[PDB]
Swiss-Prot record, chain A:
Description of post-translational modifications: Polyubiquitinated. Polyubiquitination targets ITPR1 for proteasomal degradation. Approximately 40% of the ITPR1-associated ubiquitin is monoubiquitin, and polyubiquitins are both 'Lys-48'- and 'Lys-63'-linked.
Protein name in UniProt: Inositol 1,4,5-trisphosphate-gated calcium channel ITPR1
Biological classification of the source: Eukaryota, Metazoa, Chordata, Craniata, Vertebrata
Subunit structure: Homotetramer. Homodimer. Interacts with ERP44 in a pH-, redox state- and calcium-dependent manner which results in the inhibition the calcium channel activity. The strength of this interaction inversely correlates with calcium concentration. Part of cGMP kinase signaling complex at least composed of ACTA2/alpha-actin, CNN1/calponin H1, PLN/phospholamban, PRKG1 and ITPR1. Interacts with IRAG1. Interacts with CABP1 (via N-terminus). Interacts with TESPA1.
Family (UniProt): Belongs to the InsP3 receptor family.
Gene name per UniProt: Itpr1
Shown residues within the full chain: 205 to 255 of 2750
Amino acid sequence: GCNEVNSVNCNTSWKIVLFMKWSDNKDDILKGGDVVRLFHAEQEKFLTCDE
Amino acid sequence: AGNEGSWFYIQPFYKLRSIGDSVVIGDKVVLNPVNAGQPLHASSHQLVDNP
């Protein structure tokens, strides 16, 4: 299933909720909605998984 | 005496935590002589008056 939405006559509900703020968005922070690379690891290493 | 050798080694290392910041409590690389002066003993070397 892979429809979409535009133009033609049809009523529809929408919208979202709690995602990002004026507070968090700038900057670095922990960009929770858009976190990047997995690693704890400081053993000269930044481990992250692979198959 | 507060003389030449004390003076400390410029004082961080490990990995966590680069020079140019505040360390409060942790564990650290301590003094060098200006005369070089680090690294340092851990030793297994003592005499009879004490264990």
